[model samples]
Target chain A: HMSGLKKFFPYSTNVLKGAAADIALPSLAGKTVFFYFSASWCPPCRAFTPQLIDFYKAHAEKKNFEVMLISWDESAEDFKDYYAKMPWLALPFEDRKGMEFLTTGFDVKSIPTLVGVEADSGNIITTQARTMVVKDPEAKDFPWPNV
Target chain B: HMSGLKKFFPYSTNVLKGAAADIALPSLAGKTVFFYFSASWCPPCRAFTPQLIDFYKAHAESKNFEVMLISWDESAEDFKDYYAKMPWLALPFEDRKGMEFLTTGFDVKSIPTLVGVEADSGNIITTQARTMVVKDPEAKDFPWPNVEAK
Candidate 1:
């Protein structure tokens, strides 16, 4: 169960980071992570970010939940500006392999997509987590359950 | 130049049709065609369709511009109903191979896309014809040249 996260993120160092500093993947162990696929140039993504931030603030620690930004932003400066608006951690901009792993691995075709993954199994809980948040902002729906 | 359409549509029969009859590809020899990738099920496509219809009405005959519906409809009945709304010609509902060829060839990722292609070489004129329509509904900027990739 604990080893599931290791498969997706083999190396803890240089994988992900926060607004303040680099985040060790082990720190996110046991957390239900929300991989938010988004971009600065995308209007739909911008519209959804505030809601996601509010959602994260409400339930992150309470539900043992976390969010990781998987940016679709085209520029590093753009990524920096957009990341400042986010209240969570992110896959490093330079870590293109990690970004591709999350983006392609999830089959993310569009922006503002939120994919929830179970920490214990590293298996996806819901690909429609954004819709779930809209339907159940309080997350009384928990991990959202399905696509 | 005249044979460009032949490579794309080897059989003129059962390939495309208008509201009243099946159209032979050879009839479009010198025209500039707009391959309108759309569907009735999608809202953005719906919003764009009427504008496209208007654009076609104004320019189809004068500019030798034509539009072909390359539907992404899920249902046959839906395709029929949507096709009824368009005055232009379309790939037949059963022609999945043709539709896939057009869709895949152009690398169309999103909908409400209008791709302009030359009848002579079957070469793409522009994939940003939708923006052209928005900017010049009268088509003053006929066959918009591009900086757009898709």
Candidate 2:
């Protein structure tokens, strides 16, 4: 039921997730996205979601890339029990329309900041990079997390 | 009546144009001190306050420089009617004591952003540039409103 229309200065929307109608970034082509504002009782997003699930399984043959998680969490069964212990992709719980592009086009004052969208042209390559998946996932992962 | 140990942070000694002290970062000793969070009912902070008052009247004299116009505006007579018609140096209302040094030592967000600091030990020289300003000026008549680069 996310019909698109709320674009008040970065109210960014793409919809689809549950029952999988599939559609999160309208066009993140070659894929390398990874927005992730974060929530679900934010204890540093549950300690940065198990190091971004071990850096997406150590880049498991990086076929492009993806990780859109977006949530300010409160309920939807706590974002579906933290999206059933994450891996990636989450934006439904009645889609909050990307929390107004994570609070007015990435002005997110705080909370797990990690935006690196470039999937073909979503254009936003590391708008403040800061996600630590340590031990050399190609050395220094994506430096920007100071919380 | 400000002086609850005056320090002024993200501002809010109790709302209504909070922040009331810590005004003394001039000369910007080394270079990189900007604490312009802003308010005045905001509207992109009144379009970035006339482009930061025309970039402080075109760099009113050079020196490491400095700027500190903190306010949430509501009293102090609405911060002296919008900081006595503004120019620079307006912080003294409620003051939230350097709001945790402005959100954990400089991580500010929103409102005509421009947070830099270190103009000689003011610290935080990297809060990520936004509306950058600074050209040259040690006196071109300076002081259009409060010009102070030197």
Candidate 3:
């Protein structure tokens, strides 16, 4: 399993210890962060995971890339068990709930969404919902290190 | 109060009708309608009311103007009593609670907001917060309407 395309950007979830292993996003400090909201069981996520992994593997290095798996499905046990088999950081399932920071602040509805943000400012770059998956194959790819 | 240089457009709201008075929206039928979500307790509503009233008085004869007030404050009794003094119709206060229509459909935050809609086509014209107030000069007549709360 590879890190999906969502792994490159950052999401503004209520950051708690161990909620999607704390990631250092210094490069993203002066720019924006994109919160990728998705569920593993979602059919579209299932389909897009492979493509995202391919993108992450290609751009993991050189770019200030970080991906936090925000799962809307699976319980905490289920998520922990699932993440054990995976290689990326993930926010605990329960962490996604009761947080108006995402819903009211970002104004999202659908899943498998790629939101862009300015790294330094942490201000929203865009929430257009379709910015991901629409890729340029010829673009130079970055190398991702093993976690 | 003198009408502002701005125009007041029609707005849409979830209508709640009773045996006594049917909730109606004529301005939204063939023309664009804006949904005005506000409450009597909200200070912004106090500021926007007279401006909208001026707009109504000026455009009521020509434009397909309609406005339905949905109260987010006051009890049903107070809402009815307040509506009696209002220049427009209102949604029953009881119907607004626990309803997903506003949260999901309108996605509102804050108060005294306007959501524009294309009446005949049922198309959403715009959900911009300040569009209506900015478009109408009447919004300027009230000192509070144009001034942002700090």
Candidate 4:
């Protein structure tokens, strides 16, 4: 049985794709997902993006973690330009509804908000994923429980 | 004798604004002006921007040079976001005539095109200023004469 979160992965565009293509998500049975909401125009978002890259690089393999960028850029071109620097998957720029659904569903009111959720259960683990990523680079006791 | 280009300077916004208010072009006399035409969304523009920044820093004072960005951005917010990274002056985002004058008057056909002009005469020095800046970092024999030096 698959989770709603796993089903959402097929909708994402591969960040490495030079031409149009879709990438299937690996099995989410024991994985953690991070939904990153950000924009290129936002200074704080730009600053925090690199930090996320470092954190992802460190924990991606060991923790079975994945980050899906949800861009709030002004245009598809802007999203492409900014996404070029990221080493993670992203929602297709034209999928405005998909982006809106995540932001609105999670009540994300600010840029650079990272929401951590259990991949199998689709249950939100923590809304302060940004803090965990920034503070805990090693993912020490990760999927940081809600305290 | 001031060039017609000086008339366009008032339309530019100072990117280096600190404590002082807007700086006028009179301070740029005897300098060579690089009119940078670009947009943030363009990949090549983004790549060239950092190089342009370094070039400007190296030559702005020593060579009596200045770069005035003419954005082809979609909106004022986009312009502001892009301009924040630049270390030179830019045409005010709302100044449609000023932007149009540069692009149409200079026959700029592409983004990231840098046109070098004599600051005093407003006479265009070369439309291939991008080639010069990218190739020649020191701007050897700057204010590159209109005629190809033999």
Candidate 5:
């Protein structure tokens, strides 16, 4: 009965499954999921996203590792263009409820904020994953001790 | 014992003098001041700034009215580039104490937040001035009833 993505995205329409496919929230149970809050228009986001993609491609396929983008783009067109480049999943473009849930839940005010949580328990492992990925892109100090 | 601009910006270095000249804080005593918190990196901030400037140009100095910027630019370079366009004053780039005072003091969470206050009493007249300026660019409903909100 722990809080998780289910708490935030109850409706199937709240999220996208990697830009095209449909994803089931339960499939990510017990995974270490990083909630990446960013926008296409923010220069800092654009600068950091490529690095995040590099990190994701390098380590995302490892056991229980995942990433989800919560876009802050003001326009759906921008969201579409940006989300296409990401290899992982995302909260649907302008999913107001879903965006607000994670955005408010995580207290994200700035762009390119990467927060990692234990998807089953919703326990946050890192609030500084943006800097963490830059410093240790190899996942040397991933987020926590085998969470 | 009322709060005022002095409470937040005490040192001469806490703020800037327009973009070049130096003006003392007490000069703005008993004024209605807007603390405009924004950043060059924020898209919404960029969109609103021009409108804010137009508003400022039209309404400032109708007696006891002023505005100060609290920038959130990450680089001094960007801060200068953005500030250069403004015809008003700003908290110095990365002025940690001054920035923290208002950022934490007012509980400012996002960019383009224009908080209007009675500088003499430090009483907030409007936290919604960002929207107010947009809706009433003429400021027909400027902050309050001439500080009677005090």
Candidate 6:
């Protein structure tokens, strides 16, 4: 388990403005952090991304939730272009080792995986985050119980 | 005819470092400017691009020449990835009108076409720049004659 992974929020950018910014991990204390692993080249990931974006916009503030993107893009350029469309934070493009650490630590076997963890405890709350968001757009029962 | 075109030397980013920078068109005065039209998705363009890069590296300084990329990529991201491989400058991705201005003005109908122009006068010296560079890698005679025969 990659507990306490929030220590690696890394630098990110504002999706709309393309401005450089940093993700303040400590500020996320007591919230639910969702690690989104996907890429621009993956067709399925592309199809699902917008839906996730919509869900994040609707429930993020009320539910105390945050999404941090972990890209699988072919290049930094592709990552920047794809990331600009999202409304959430993302891992920096140059951190290849950071990407590897999270992917392997989480045992990510496929793209479009979302792992939900409680920010304060660093304990994983759910790995079925994608399906949960897709099925429950309102996130009425967010932070789904640990399985 | 398009002598006023130098006003649109749009900002471009360094291919390797992704740093934003501008092309100094005035500095290109009295020199030859090579307009490279290409895209990342085009296989033939991909194959020919490296050769142009080599030609630019070899002769740009000594021959008083420069190359500027005008991409046909689907998005700015695609353009950046493709442009990163070369040492030349490019038209800023957001300047769509600038791209059309140059392409249509020069009657560009294909990818990998290198149009050589005298920067100050904007006089097209050759539309066959690809063949010129390929034939004479050293650019021994420097800027080839305006007429095709010689």
Residue by residue across A65-147, what tens digits does model 3's lDDT show?
Answer: 54555554434664565445444445555554432245334554334555665554454555542333344433332221111
Reference-based TM-score of each model: 0.50, 0.24, 0.39, 0.47, 0.55, 0.46
Docking class of 2: incorrect
Each predicted complex: what DockQ?
Answer: 0.01, 0.01, 0.03, 0.01, 0.01, 0.01
lDDT score of residue B104 within candidate 1: 67
lDDT of 5: 0.72
After the best TM-score superposition of candidate 2, give how far the Cα of residue B124 lies from its true spot, in angstroms: 17
**lDDT (C-alpha) at residue B114 in model 3:** 66
Candidate 1 regions with alpha-carbon error over 4 angstroms: A10-12, A15-17, B1-150
* Residue-wise C-alpha lDDT for candidate 2, range A1-147, written one tens digit per residue: 112222321433454444463664544456566667665433345555787777766662463566767666655776777777776666665656555445447655445566765555445656544424444456344533332
Provide the lDDT at A133 for model 5. 84
Q: What digit string (tens of lDDT, one per residue) describes model 5 on residues A18-99? A: 5465676777877888998776544446667899889988888774578888876656776788888888888886565667
lDDT of 1 by residue, A1-147 (tens): 367776665433534455556666677777888888776544345557898888889999888888988876656886888797777888777666667666557866445578889877788887778877867898897887874
Q: Pick the candidate with the highest TM-score.
A: 5
lDDT of each residue in A1-147, candidate 6, tens digit only: 233654554323222124556445666777888888876644346657889989988888988788888876657777788898888877776776677777767866455678998887777889878777878887877766756
Off by over 4 Å in 2: A1-35, A38-66, A72-88, A93-109, A113-147, B1-81, B84-150
Model 2 chain B — which ten-residue stretch has the worst lDDT?
B141-150
> How does residue A73 of candidate 4 score in lDDT?
66
Q: List the residue pairs that clash in candidate 1.
A: none
Residues B48-144, candidate 6: write the lDDT tens digits.
8888888888888888888888888889889888888878777777777778866765557788878666666444455557777778888985565
- lDDT per residue for candidate 1 within B32-76, as digits (tens), equals 878899998899998988888888888889989888888899888
- Per-model C-alpha lDDT, please? 0.73, 0.50, 0.47, 0.70, 0.72, 0.70
Model 3 interface DockQ: 0.03
> Which ranges in model 5 have alpha carbons more than 4 Å from their true place?
A1-3, A144-147, B1-150
Those runs of model 6 whose alpha carbons end farther than 4 Å from true positions after fitting are A1-3, A6-18, B1-150
